[PDB]
Amino acid sequence: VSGGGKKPWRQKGTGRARAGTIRSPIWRGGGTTFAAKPRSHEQKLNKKMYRAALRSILAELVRLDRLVVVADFAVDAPKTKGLVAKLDTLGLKDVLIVTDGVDENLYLAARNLAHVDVRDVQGSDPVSLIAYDKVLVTVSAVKKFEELLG
Amino acid sequence: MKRTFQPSTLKRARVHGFRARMATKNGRQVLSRRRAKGRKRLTV
Amino acid sequence: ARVKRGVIARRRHKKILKLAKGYYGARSRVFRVAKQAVIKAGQYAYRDRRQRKRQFRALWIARINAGARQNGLSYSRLIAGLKKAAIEIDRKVLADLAVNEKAAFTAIVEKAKASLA
RNA sequence: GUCAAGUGAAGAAGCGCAUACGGUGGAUGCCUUGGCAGUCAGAGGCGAUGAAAGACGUGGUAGCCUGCGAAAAGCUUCGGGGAGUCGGCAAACAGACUUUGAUCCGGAGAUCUCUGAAUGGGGGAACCCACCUAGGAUAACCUAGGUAUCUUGUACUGAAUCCAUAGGUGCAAGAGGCGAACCAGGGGAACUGAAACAUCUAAGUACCCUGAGGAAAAGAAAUCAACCGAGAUUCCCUUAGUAGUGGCGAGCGAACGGGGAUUAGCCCUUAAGCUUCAUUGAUUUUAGCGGAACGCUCUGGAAAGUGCGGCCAUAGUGGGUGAUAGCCCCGUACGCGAAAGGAUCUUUGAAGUGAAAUCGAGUAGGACGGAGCACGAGAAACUUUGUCUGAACAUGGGGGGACCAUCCUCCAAGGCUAAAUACUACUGACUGACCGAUAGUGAACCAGUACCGUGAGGGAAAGGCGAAAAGAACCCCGGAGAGGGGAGUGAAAUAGAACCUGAAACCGUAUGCGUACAAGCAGUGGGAGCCUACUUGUUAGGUGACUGCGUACCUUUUGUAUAAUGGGUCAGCGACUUAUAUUCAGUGGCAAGCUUAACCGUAUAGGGUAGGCGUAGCGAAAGCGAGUCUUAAUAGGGCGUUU
RNA sequence: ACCCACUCCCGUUGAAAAGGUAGGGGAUGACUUGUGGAUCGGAGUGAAAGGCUAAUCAAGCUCGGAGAUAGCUGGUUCUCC
RNA sequence: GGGCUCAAACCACACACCGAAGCUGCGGGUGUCACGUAAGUGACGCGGUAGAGGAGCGUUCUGUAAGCCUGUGAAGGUGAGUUGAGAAGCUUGCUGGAGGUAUCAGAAGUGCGAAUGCUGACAUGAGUAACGACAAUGGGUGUGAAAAACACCCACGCCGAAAGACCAAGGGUUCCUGCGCAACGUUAAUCGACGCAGGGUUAGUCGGUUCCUAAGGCGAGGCUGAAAAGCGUAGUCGAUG
RNA sequence: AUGACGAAGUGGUUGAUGCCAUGCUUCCAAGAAAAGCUUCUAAGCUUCAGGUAACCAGGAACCGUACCCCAAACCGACACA
RNA sequence: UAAAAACACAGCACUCUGCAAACACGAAAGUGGACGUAUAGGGUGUGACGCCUGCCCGGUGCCGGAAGGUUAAUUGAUGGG
RNA sequence: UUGUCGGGUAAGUUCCGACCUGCACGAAUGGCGUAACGAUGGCGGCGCUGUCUCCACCCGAGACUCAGUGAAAUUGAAAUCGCUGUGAAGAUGCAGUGUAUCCGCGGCUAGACGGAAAGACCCCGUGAACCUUUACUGUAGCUUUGCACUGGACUUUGAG
Ligand SMILES: [Mg+2]
Ligand SMILES: [Mg+2]
Ligand SMILES: [Mg+2]
Ligand SMILES: [Mg+2]
Ligand SMILES: [Mg+2]
Ligand SMILES: [Mg+2]
Ligand SMILES: [Mg+2]
Ligand SMILES: [Mg+2]
Ligand SMILES: [Mg+2]
Ligand SMILES: [Mg+2]
Ligand SMILES: [Mg+2]
Ligand SMILES: [Mg+2]
Ligand SMILES: [Mg+2]
Ligand SMILES: [Mg+2]
Ligand SMILES: [Mg+2]
Ligand SMILES: [Mg+2]
Ligand SMILES: [Mg+2]
Ligand SMILES: [Mg+2]
Ligand SMILES: [Mg+2]
Ligand SMILES: [Mg+2]
Ligand SMILES: [Mg+2]
Ligand SMILES: [Mg+2]
Ligand SMILES: [Mg+2]
Ligand SMILES: [Mg+2]
Ligand SMILES: [Mg+2]
Ligand SMILES: [Mg+2]
Ligand SMILES: [Mg+2]
Ligand SMILES: [Mg+2]
Ligand SMILES: [Mg+2]
Ligand SMILES: [Mg+2]
Ligand SMILES: [Mg+2]
Ligand SMILES: [Mg+2]
Ligand SMILES: [Mg+2]
Ligand SMILES: [Mg+2]
Ligand SMILES: [Mg+2]
Ligand SMILES: [Mg+2]
Ligand SMILES: [Mg+2]
Ligand SMILES: [Mg+2]
Ligand SMILES: [Mg+2]
Ligand SMILES: [Mg+2]
Ligand SMILES: [Mg+2]
Ligand SMILES: [Mg+2]
Ligand SMILES: [Mg+2]
Ligand SMILES: [Mg+2]
Ligand SMILES: [Mg+2]
Ligand SMILES: [Mg+2]
Ligand SMILES: [Mg+2]
Ligand SMILES: [Mg+2]
Ligand SMILES: [Mg+2]
Ligand SMILES: [Mg+2]
Ligand SMILES: [Mg+2]
Ligand SMILES: [Mg+2]
Ligand SMILES: [Mg+2]
Ligand SMILES: [Mg+2]
Ligand SMILES: [Mg+2]
Ligand SMILES: [Mg+2]
Ligand SMILES: [Mg+2]
Ligand SMILES: [Mg+2]
Ligand SMILES: [Mg+2]
Ligand SMILES: [Mg+2]
Ligand SMILES: [Mg+2]
Ligand SMILES: [Mg+2]
Ligand SMILES: [Mg+2]
Ligand SMILES: [Mg+2]
Ligand SMILES: [Mg+2]
Ligand SMILES: [Mg+2]
Ligand SMILES: [Mg+2]
Ligand SMILES: [Mg+2]
Ligand SMILES: [Mg+2]
Ligand SMILES: [Mg+2]
Ligand SMILES: [Mg+2]
Ligand SMILES: [Mg+2]
Ligand SMILES: [Mg+2]
Ligand SMILES: [Mg+2]
Ligand SMILES: [Mg+2]
Ligand SMILES: [Mg+2]
Ligand SMILES: [Mg+2]
């Protein structure tokens, strides 16, 4: 904190409580006692711990009927209207789309959609696999999941 | 009772003015410090 | 991250002062004075749950003594007589009879007098 | 009826409690104008062509801020732009400008007082006094330019002193000063720790000083290694808190080796580079342009909210708009855009430099005294040098931690060299399990201000009407006041300008009950009466006569009502955190294995298994090994082995 | 006059962070005084009291090392078992 | 303490009774064991500082959440009722006028009465002390909303080697005039060194500048010094002359 | 305030700490400097320039100036004994 | 909060100092001493004046001496590895 | 020790003179005297007096009352009596008892261990500062010698 080098008054005699600085954390406008500094919050997760959690999530998604498997999923043009029509045929509104390789047109078509996310297999984090109402996954991405976690 | 401040603008200038400060290197440091803090008044 | 204490602190202080209602001076207006008064009143209230049972029994026994002496018996002789003749009417009910049902109380005293001799 | 005795309400100067309504005050909530921290870029300097920083001026009207400089909220021009404009506090009237394209935005020019390195001389900064040249006025001057010092170079002159030299004069080029950090170097504490203290630590830290650059420094083995080899420098992770060092105290603390990031080497028989000026193309930056798609209905002051039905999306969690908007506005994704200037890459060319010339001699080595190497004299190698000395010449020399021999490895006393690395005062964008007016910058507000100080220096407080001023015409009291009462505006005025909400302390007015024969932590247990309200008395609320019991709290103590400590009260703030190593427990993953670090990675994935721990111990150790150590001992015994 | 400060009283939240009233000493001198200047922090200056160096002196003030250190004092905030 | 004496004292004996949060009764909660693979039963426990162990409440932010609630009224504020063993929760009247957040997780600037704590506000003392030289006032008139204090007049009193008039330093508009009185003035104020506006300072001779130097400063070269610098020559400043 | 006129306006005495006086006397502690000013020349200049005197003509720039100043305006936080 | 008997003082004495003085401030240059030169300058003590100022050189200091002992850096005989 | 004697007083731990038994004077840290001087210490006297016996009266300024303005320290909260006991050992608050209607104003200071300043005395802390010295360890300065700058010559000086 700015200033605060000088002792505000002599230690004895004035009748006040003894003070060393006007920036004591006791004082208004003084320092924060345990002032924060920029620190990192990332924990370590074991590689196998991460994979075991992914296996648990994938098994639970199948058991809860929240996993939808399709042979393929491609859109022709990067049009949001086209993707909405495709997902309405499958009856999906809140959905995470997992593909082996994220298509450039598919990425653009889903960018503005409210509750639709398109991810590569490597990009399918535990949080997105749980948050989204359904996880539509292609057959190619299912096999790519098997190689990674099995 | 004579008090400690007996004003003399000539003495004030010769001891604390701009040219008194610029004459030495520690005086130039005062002007650098007071410019860095942004003092509206630099010398007296 | 930063947590202001104003709303929670005000709710705490108001609960204490609401309990200090009716107290004199600072004991009903000033928090750190009202806080001591609310604690002390609680200490008294806990202790006076015990003392109330003693106070009422002393009151029953005194009224039974007055009622029985009107019938020729002291309290101690009546209680001994009420044990010789197995009468288990307690002192709260006995003190109510001695005041409100004097004919009933006289019958009990005569039953104790007969039992003694 | 008289007397007597007994009993006895009501009558409160004031006070208490409750409730209602106010006042003061400015908490809380909500909000944001401002901050804080990162990430990605940019730029890494400005200055004698006058800087940073200022003073004084400059406007129709006073001041201050902003801009600008006697050409003075500005002039010229080139682009953008297309209807308003004459900056803000902070408006009111004036006078104007503008589709003959103004205001505004960007590039380039012009002007640019005075002070400040300040530089013609002087000086108490913003002032005083000059000289020289050229021109033009005749009076008492005017315009333009020049006039500092030092360094380098050059020309002319030039003493003591003959030649010279020192010196002097002119000219040309350059420098000086400022800036938060980063870099290299000179000088260099103490508190503190060692539970005292001197060696030691703190620490080559703080600070002072010098120099340079966008980076700097270093850098191409007289280097390690170990008989195998590696192959400049710099940086990150390990090795490892190990070897060692240390009043062997407190502490300090490697390297070898390994994994990575970057990669580059060139010359003294004169090069790679670097600088400048051309020059060929690429980008990039400094203004901008277009940019989709919504209606009805209900509540409402107002619709974006309700209900119903649509459409756009490479644009959907942006900011506003009278409450919550993809489709109302500004934007956003996306696609275009430069007359002119800046910058970065490049293709050639030109000089300049690197440049020390020509392979290193007062050098290597040595003695003394220091310093550094993790290494404090130690058995002390190596580097460096204040004093003093002092080689050899590849058939030579340096190192391999005393020293010697053998072996290996290198070639010092000459140079230049990018990248990976450090930092952010500054500019832009983006972001936040950051703050939200006692917080966050000291500073949200005309803050480094007010104020305090001789001075260096210290250093505040202070945000919110409403959607919109619609900011209350008019009437009345009042001093042609202050302040109010109406009226009106507004959805709301107890939103009325000290204006959102509007807490507490604290101060009042009103009502109810209690209170003037009564002794103390002021309550608590019992409890009459009165009052109020309905539920009309086994009720609720207020008060509470009388009475039992009863010496606050915190701290500190053997022990506190203590006449021990602390607190006038309220409101806000105010104290076990964080990082890195580690042990134990719990709970998970994997399991004779487990796990990665740096780093890479269209990046929380995946790779990377160098390293760490474990699977074997004993011994000081060589070593041996389910054994080992001690010992003459295969005996005893120690530790270990059956998980 | 001016410089000084011996006594008493007052004043002591003062008119005043050292004064006032009444008395007192020096008053051509080692005098008093204005303006300007020099000397300062382990330093100055001192007819010497550890005096004075901006109401601060047995080592000024200001900023920095710095959040020195404090085996000491104080304080340490919601609930229940 | 009142009072007490064939006691209300003392000695002995006896039968009664009072007396605690002890024991029992009745209702409830909780700990640990055991039986229970259950709800629950059984037994024994349940004062407590330092301290260890266990289980929770609440606050701010993040996710859940482009959800849900909300102008038919959010947060906050202020009452009432009600629920739990507690931290606390819930419902509602009024105020308020735009935000809030279920649940379960995750993070903390997470809880205040003390620190002669810090900042602001406001009390008590108390309408008390004081209103700053004991040189001194009285009256009349005017103006004004209002006059002890302003202006004028008539008196009185005080200073007069100053309490008068100046120059310097220092200050800086305080000077004068018109309007004005909120605050400032230790009271009031029409008055003012106060507020708003306007005006006012005229030099050959006064004082500066300019000329000259004192102490002293700076100081080309120079000498000295790790650097920063120190000293000083030529010079150049510097009045108090 | 307004604009014309306006009488007397003379002797004596006393008399400074002011002036002569930067003098005079005396003493010891022995009492600024520089320039302006007068004069003399050197280098230079030699009909010149420059100097002197007279007359005529003209000029004298810039800054301060209000006000308080033993004080209510300065130093003392104050309209401060 | 001390004005004194404290400090100073004239006078006295001791001692240092031959001038580039001793001594002091300064890393140094330099400066003061002093534009002085032992009748001078510094330091120390005493404190007008009058009468005086006695004894002790063991300790410590200072001054003078240098036969002997001891004694630094340095040098490196000799011995042992 | 107020030594003893003498003087001074009615009475003199002070004073003056003296004695010498100097706890523990003493000769330039000077001894002993000393005119003059001193806001210097002690003692005595004259005068003078409200210093006092012993205070009285008077005059101004406060205090007091009214009108205007308007602080302070302190403060856990107060419904804040005596006495005797008790008690962290000296009680407005505890026990017992006595007294006592409620509330101001002028006064006074016995208490509220009254207010003010984290006692300064005392002790402690392996606290600080500054001062001293023949405490320790250092060090500026001063001084000794070697080597360097640094040379020629001649002479007294050991071994080759
Ligand atoms: Mg802060
Ligand atoms: Mg990984
Ligand atoms: Mg009344
Ligand atoms: Mg100049
Ligand atoms: Mg100059
Ligand atoms: Mg010659
Ligand atoms: Mg430079
Ligand atoms: Mg220590
Ligand atoms: Mg540069
Ligand atoms: Mg380089
Ligand atoms: Mg080889
Ligand atoms: Mg659009
Ligand atoms: Mg609204
Ligand atoms: Mg070489
Ligand atoms: Mg060497
Ligand atoms: Mg070597
Ligand atoms: Mg070796
Ligand atoms: Mg080389
Ligand atoms: Mg702030
Ligand atoms: Mg607020
Ligand atoms: Mg209406
Ligand atoms: Mg609002
Ligand atoms: Mg309001
Ligand atoms: Mg009564
Ligand atoms: Mg009472
Ligand atoms: Mg009750
Ligand atoms: Mg009682
Ligand atoms: Mg004790
Ligand atoms: Mg007790
Ligand atoms: Mg107490
Ligand atoms: Mg008490
Ligand atoms: Mg207290
Ligand atoms: Mg006299
Ligand atoms: Mg002393
Ligand atoms: Mg002082
Ligand atoms: Mg010190
Ligand atoms: Mg430190
Ligand atoms: Mg501290
Ligand atoms: Mg019984
Ligand atoms: Mg019981
Ligand atoms: Mg029990
Ligand atoms: Mg039970
Ligand atoms: Mg128990
Ligand atoms: Mg318990
Ligand atoms: Mg909130
Ligand atoms: Mg509080
Ligand atoms: Mg507490
Ligand atoms: Mg009083
Ligand atoms: Mg009074
Ligand atoms: Mg009074
Ligand atoms: Mg007065
Ligand atoms: Mg009035
Ligand atoms: Mg006067
Ligand atoms: Mg005036
Ligand atoms: Mg007034
Ligand atoms: Mg005025
Ligand atoms: Mg000089
Ligand atoms: Mg020079
Ligand atoms: Mg001059
Ligand atoms: Mg003068
Ligand atoms: Mg004048
Ligand atoms: Mg004062
Ligand atoms: Mg006055
Ligand atoms: Mg005055
Ligand atoms: Mg005195
Ligand atoms: Mg003496
Ligand atoms: Mg005698
Ligand atoms: Mg005698
Ligand atoms: Mg003596
Ligand atoms: Mg002698
Ligand atoms: Mg003497
Ligand atoms: Mg005298
Ligand atoms: Mg009054
Ligand atoms: Mg007592
Ligand atoms: Mg009194
Ligand atoms: Mg006291
Ligand atoms: Mg103490």
Q: Which H or E element spans position A137?
A: strand A134-138
Residues forming beta bridges with residue A116, ordered by sequence position: A95
Nucleotides of D under 7 A from a protein CB: 16-19, 27-29, 37-38, 52-55, 116-117, 123-126, 177-180, 209-210, 312-316, 433-436, 438-443, 447-450, 453-461, 503-506, 521-526, 542-544, 548-549, 552-553, 567, 569-580, 588-590, 594-597, 603-609
d(CA A13, CA A32): 29
The rounded distance, in Å, linking the Cα atoms of C41 and C51 is: 14
**In angstroms, what is the resolution?**
2.5
| Chain C neighbours, 3+ Cβ pairs < 8 A | none
Q: How was this structure determined?
A: cryo-EM
**H/E stretch holding B20:** helix B18-23
Q: Which residues contact A55 (CB under 8 A, 6 or more apart)?
A: A149, A150
DSSP A103: -
CA of A74 to the centre of ligand 16 (A): 75
Give nucleotides in strand F with any atom < 7 A to a protein C-beta: 16-21, 58-61, 63-64, 66, 76-80, 87-89, 107-119, 169-171, 218, 228-229, 239
Q: Using the 8-state DSSP alphabet, how is residue A122 labeled?
A: T
Looking at C6-101, list the stretches that DSSP marks H as alpha helix, in order from N- to C-terminal side: 6-19, 31-69, 75-84, 91-100
Candidates 1.25.40.10, 3.30.300.20, 1.10.287.3980, 1.10.10.10; CATH matching B1-44: 1.10.287.3980
Neighbours of A135 (CB within 10 A): 26
Task: Quote the ligand 73 centre to A29 CA distance (angstroms).
Answer: 44
Cβ C26 to strand I below 7 Å = yes
Residues 6+ away with beta carbon under 8 Å from A53: A126
Sheet holding A116-120, edge to edge: A67-70, A134-138, A95-99, A116-120
Q: Which residue has the tokens 């711990």?
A: A49
How far, in Å, is the centroid of ligand 23 from the Cα of C5? 23
The DSSP line for C70-95 is: TTT--HHHHHHHHHHTT----HHHHH
CA C114 and chain centroid, separation:
33
Q: Residue A65 in contact with residue A136, Cβ under 8 Å?
A: no
The DSSP secondary-structure symbol of C101 reads -
Instruction: Please count the other Cβ atoms lying within 10 Å of the Cβ belonging to residue A109.
Output: 23
| Contact of A30 with A21, CB cutoff 8 Å | yes
Pairwise CA distance, residues A124 & B15, whole Å: 74
Report how far residue B27's alpha carbon sits from residue C104's, in angstroms, rounded to the nearest whole number: 112
Distance, CA of A81 to C1' of D244, in Å: 74
**CA–CA dist A120, A115 (Å, integer):** 17
